[PDB]
Design a protein around this ligand. Structure first.
Ligand SMILES: CC(=O)c1nc(NC(=O)[C@@H]2CNCCN2)sc1-c1cncc(N)c1
Ligand SMILES: CC(=O)c1nc(NC(=O)[C@H]2CNCCN2)sc1-c1cncc(N)c1
Length: 130
């Protein structure tokens, strides 16, 4: 229905705004673009489902997120990929792990503070009806 399409449009506007706020944060620049196979050749040895904030923006605009849970699954994938590719005590690893956890925590905190729980519940019930 028209009311349901309005609901998903509001979700997309909200998700673009959150994603922009993550992408301009200096701490998260490592997560703003895909990893380059020439710059990093061993990345695909470890990571089978790459994700980054530019890909998240593309998916919003392709209407791939119908709930905030769908969106947070990809935020969590950015974080879990970073943790798996950076598991060692090396300071470079540890810095990326710290930023990855901060990205996830920041996204969850924005949503907890700013997304109405009844709005998210409506998104879920529309999705469940399709
Ligand atoms: C600082 C750091 O590198 C770090 N590493 C983590 N490692 C891990 O989560 C995993 C889990 N079991 C240990 C090895 N593998 S959590 C974490 C972290 C700590 N406090 C604040 C923030 N933002 C991040
Ligand atoms: C996305 C990610 O997780 C990532 N991790 C890295 N880790 C390291 O370089 C660790 C690996 N262990 C040895 C010490 N260096 S570089 C990197 C990255 C690569 N190309 C483009 C972007 N934007 C980020």
């Amino acid at each position: 229905s028209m009311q349901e399409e309005d609901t998903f449009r509001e979700l997309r506007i909200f998700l673009r705004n959150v994603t922009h706020r993550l992408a301009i944060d200096k701490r998260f620049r490592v997560f703003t673009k895909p990893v380059d196979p020439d710059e990093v050749p061993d990345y695909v040895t470890v990571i089978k489902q790459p994700m980054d904030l530019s890909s998240v923006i593309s998916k919003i605009d392709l209407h791939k997120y119908l709930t905030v849970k769908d969106y947070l699954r990809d935020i969590d994938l950015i974080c879990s990929n970073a943790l798996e590719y950076n598991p060692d005590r090396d300071p470079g690893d540890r810095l990326i792990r710290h930023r990855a956890c901060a990205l996830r925590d920041t996204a969850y905190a924005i949503i907890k503070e700013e997304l109405d729980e009844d709005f998210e519940q409506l998104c879920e019930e529309i999705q469940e009806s399709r």
